[model samples]
Target chain A: MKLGALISESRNPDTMDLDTLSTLEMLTRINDEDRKVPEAIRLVIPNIAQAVDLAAKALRDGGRLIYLGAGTSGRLGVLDASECPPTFGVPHGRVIGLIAGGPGALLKAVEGAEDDVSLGERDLRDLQLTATDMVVGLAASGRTPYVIGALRFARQLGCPTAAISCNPDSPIAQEALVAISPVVGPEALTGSTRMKSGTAQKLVLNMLSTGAMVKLGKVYQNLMVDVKATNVKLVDRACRIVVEATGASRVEAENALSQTEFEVKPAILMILKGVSVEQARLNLQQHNGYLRAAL
Target chain B: MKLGALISESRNPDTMDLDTLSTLEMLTRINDEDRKVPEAIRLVIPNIAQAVDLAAKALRDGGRLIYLGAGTSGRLGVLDASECPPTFGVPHGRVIGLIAGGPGALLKAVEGAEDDVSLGERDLRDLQLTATDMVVGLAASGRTPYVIGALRFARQLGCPTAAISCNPDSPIAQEALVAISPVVGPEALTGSTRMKSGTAQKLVLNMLSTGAMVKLGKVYQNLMVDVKATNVKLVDRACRIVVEATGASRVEAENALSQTEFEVKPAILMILKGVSVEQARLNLQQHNGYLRAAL
Candidate 1:
């Protein structure tokens, strides 16, 4: 197959004179291309919906969500996965991002890493991946050997598999149970998948992880009730979330959080359910940490 | 000021029933919100245009583009800067990303890095920052002490400074010469600017860097003519770019590139302008590496 024949690598005729355009016109054109990104994601929502179901199911069944990719795709996965612990208070390992070349690759491209198929399998195996787990392979072109290998191995191990790519019917898509291809077309800068394609992957990753988190009841009334108050700003946010979700006065919210040691979910439950801190904690456990259900 | 009063911390009313929605509807709503990110970005293109000009001028003057921030915003800046070297063939130091907590913060949040105002100034000072450098500070909430301190110090040092945030009239916005705030509104999850707000920042960063790269002649006719062929994909891409831009045979493109030690700009010039590889190199140097001007 011709490498350049891929739509992801194809040149955009509209940008043929890109070098000649004025700065304003250049930026306007780039913005115009960016405008097309979400719509591309929109077209793949059904597939993303499928990925969400599988991911949520895995989480509910005590399985992890694993993302595998290379370069920009890899970094996006790590970013989405990294935000989970701080944003939703999930355990760090519950959501994992595996890049072909390891953590260092997030900053700079690792030479020949994407070309290694066994590295992907080794990384997953090192994690002791289980059948109950869900794997989502991310690659803009969807042909990275590492991602394809990981997806294939996940399928072989009976894990539910999903793939997100900018090209339709990619190799990873063929291997995955759910294939999310947004078809973002070519980059304004030829072959710079880091531009539009990267944006499309971020949108899809956001949907998959956030949708799964919401399904797990990590959110209450759009509030990140389970967020970890790991920083000063978050400590303040934890209180506001309690107030927002339960309509408690600021002082009342503060009191409830203090009673529960600032666990927003339990604090919201205590105020809304008219319970003591211990009872609120028990109620959360009974409902599997779902605030709405506990309430 | 009440830290929670910021728009970035406000609850998204549209997603109030988020936890109660089915996975499909949840994703649909989230995508709907994401669709608004680019439009938010569009509203600030004029500001982005201004940033592009300043950034490009800095590069032309042999200055670096330095980015600073904390947490997700900090990581995004680093991510953008990292991509520039591999994408535009620029040297690593030409675009620098300095997070509040340094490289370690890229993997996990360093507890108090963002709150330490001294770290920002110290980091910039460590670089021996000069007036010729362009500094861009990023913070979703737009008030991180780390970013504010860096921008303040950069301006104090006579460097051109810009800010990218998701808030209106944010503190960082007020401190910078050019501010690009897209006002992505509250995230799907309250205070989780990693979602829509993060997307908006990524778009602005892309616009700022890519637009600046274009203005600096790193691109030729929409192609990344200055791209480093560090991998198999890039090597193929380098040849394809020549054929696409100059309509030369694949063999001739390969020959041109070989003679120039795989320098794509000189290769393209040799083919299109019917010049020797040495002549092409001299032409590029005379035009300050601008292919359009050399041709």
Candidate 2:
């Protein structure tokens, strides 16, 4: 199919005079389009949920959740993956984001990186990809050669794979085991997938990872119980998480967190279950780190 | 105020049982909240429009748009900035994205980088910031010391500044000339600002850059006339953009684009005005590269 025939590349009739509008009008047009992203994803929740299940099962089996894409799609993958360690206290390798043309492409567009089909397979091969890993390919156009190649290679290796694209029934979608295509339609600026398409990608990627983390027992109730307190703000959040979870006073929460070295889950267990720090740790371990299970 | 008091850090009552829900239900809850982002942004359009005007004026004066943040906020800044070159055909330095820990932190969590107040100033100093530059600070929690310091420095230098935060009346907001506080409420998982808050930042950053670019004449009639056809897909987009703008046949558009080395604006001008490639270039240069003006 021609690029113009693709929903993502097609021009929006509503924004044809985009440049002639006032700044406020232009912004309103953009925001009006941005609102469609989540609404589009809402229709694709079953697919996203399926992908989430695949990702959770993979991670639970000691398999990594790998994200592959190029350009804006690639950057969103990296952005989502980078947050995993800080947000869920997972090791960096557990969730990996590979961009076309490597890490340098994250800051500047590497010439023709996404067009090189072989590079995707080479990148995954360098990671020593196995059938156990879950590979999720992203492409706003859904026909990016790099992502298609990556998904093709991943599926051939018997790895479970998913595709996130803005176009329905895209090439990447057909290649993956599960397809999470949230058709956000055309962008306000003709062919500018980085706007709404990128937003949709971010929303879906966030759901996939967050949902998978929740399934892995990294979240308890509504809290990121496994979050790493790597900085002052996080340390404060850890105490607050303990306080919120266990109904402990600020001082009590701080004391409990200090005893558990700022681990919110074990700290909450220590306060709520009336256990020592060591006992809380053992209880968490006994239940495989599921705070609810330990409680 | 305590971190928990911040709307971004507050727990979502609707998602209190996030971990207990089925994968589909969990995703639905997240999507339901995701819908609120653009709605929140809609309420802050006036400030965003002001920032857009400031950014456009700064760029017209040959100034740069600089984005500063830490963690997810920092990553979103970089993500939006990186796309400027390819999206608007702008140079790399025209829009800069500075993360607290620098480029390496894009993939890995840089511990304590966001907490240092002086580092923001140092980073800006390294860039040799000028009054003509526009600095926009991003912090989901609205109190990252790094962003505050950066905004403070930018304001002190008499440079136009803007702050994007999820919290209302944040310190960073008070420091900037324009404050875009889109109260996205909270993440489905408590304190996971990487979710909804990050989406809000992405949406606003996209608007700031895109809106400013549109005002700078990079776009014509909703089309990205100045898009850099750096790759295969973009080259295809260039032809489509030319065809869309001039109502020329695809073959004619491709021929015109080939003469201009795949530059869309010049190609459109060449086709629309029946001008030579050199004549089109001269016309665009005469009109300061505004396709509409040249036409």
Candidate 3:
């Protein structure tokens, strides 16, 4: 399976005559393309679901979820991984994102980072690739050597693998346990994937991560239950969630959060069940971290 | 005036059943809603274009572009502003993103950051509130106090103001010089604006900044001609862009880039004109950064 076969369309035109268009016309054209993104994603719902379930199972068993890609794809993975702790109050090591050329490469692209197949092997080796882990490789072009290397090496380690690409028939998909390919088509700005392809990647990443968290009982209803009220703003949001979830005054929410060291899930458990943090924690554990059980 | 009112729909069931829906289901539902966003944006293109043109005028006349918001809205603004330098090689101060709670507010939520109206004024003051600037206040919910304050303050300072919101009749729409309201509707997860609202904000911010760059002639056709090949990944992409633009061989592309010190636009001009980097730079300046003249 080759990318060219799957992506029948040529790369988008590099430049359009924007100077002639009114700013309003330009806005309309861009927005029109932006509208197509979600619909394109929707066409591949079943595949996205498979990646989510596979990734979640690996994560629940204490396997790290790793994302690998090069260029904008790599950058997007890194961005998603970095966001896990802040958004869901998870530990940094729980989810990992490995981009070719390492962290410095994130700020500035590294030369030939995507071309080296061995670099993928070394990066995974550095992480001590385990069978319990899941590796999700991303590439807009679907033919990036960097991602193919990672997927091949990850499969060799007996780990669960998922490949996410904008084109079908990608090499990364061949080695993966699950393949998530959503055809977003040529970018609006030529090869500038950040416009449409980047958006598709971000939408997928957000869903996969957010969905996994929900499965781990990290969320109670629509709110992030396990979130840490680390900062003042979060404390407020946490209080609002607590107030809405278990019926508590702002003061009570604040006091309850403070008593539990600002842990959102436990604070809610204590508030709703009239239990101690110890009791709440134990209940949460018994239910596999489900707050519904505590209630 | 209020978020719930703008939708012509009210009364959420209040909370969701997180346990019943698998992570994949959650993401799928979210993606389904995300697909509708572009259409929502389509309804407001005229307004967005008006804002962009006005802002571009201010920027060209030496006015700064300042973005203000709270929480997720603020983070998206900051994200867009920060990427400009890396993406377009612009100075940070030329286009700035000012969140309500300052820099620390970006990664983690700041306490009461959204609730404070005065902080907006204070933030504008810190930037020395200039009339030769355009201020864009962003809010997923139209009535965020911080954004309202920022818009109010910007108006008082006589700076051009634009507001971005996801609700109609939003203060941003009603009060600012241009109000872009894309009614993305209720998030799949109730009020998790970070899901669809954040995406909406991202599109708007990307459009505003990108559109402004177009008006500034940072582009030729739709290609980012003046783009900086600051990173290795970008350098490769830039090389490809050069080859595409000029039909040069890889070796020629590399040589031209080396000669022009890796500035894409200048490198293209150098390739076509057979001139020194200095001469190419002069020509670009004389042509308002358009490279197609030589082509």
TM-score per model over all chains: 0.97, 0.98, 0.81
Q: Candidate 1, residues B1-295: lDDT per residue as tens digits?
A: 4688899988788988888888778888888888898889889999999999999999999999998888888878887887898788898889988877777777766646788777899999999999999999999998898988889899999999999988888999999999998988877878889889989989988888899998898998888888888777888889998888788898999999888877799998899889998898889999999888887
A62-113 per-residue lDDT for model 2 (tens digits):
8999999998899999999999987899999999999998989888877589
Q: CAPRI band of model 2? A: high
Candidate 3 lDDT over residue span A1-295, tens digit each: 5332344123444226665577877777677668668877888778888878877899889888888887667766765675577567778777877878876554444546688888888899999989999899988767778788889998988888888877777677777888777777665555455677777887888788888877877777777667655544455566677777877887888888888887888888888778888888888888887778667
lDDT measured at residue B169 in model 3 versus the true structure, 0 to 100: 79
Q: Give all candidates' CA lDDT scores.
A: 0.87, 0.91, 0.74
Model 1 chain A weakest lDDT span, ten residues long: A103-112
- The TM-score each candidate achieves on chain A is 0.97, 0.97, 0.93
* Candidate number achieving the greatest lDDT relative to the actual structure: 2
**In model 2, what are the clashing residue pairs, if there are any?**
none
In the range B1-295, model 3's lDDT, one tens digit per residue, is: 3332444122134226655675556665677677777877778788788888887899889888998888667766765675576566677788888876676554335536677888888898899879989999988777777888888988987888999987777766676888888887766654556667778788888888888887887766656566666544467766877886788887888998888777888888777778888988888778766566545
* TM-score, cand. 2: 0.98
Between candidates 1 and 2, which one is better according to lDDT? 2
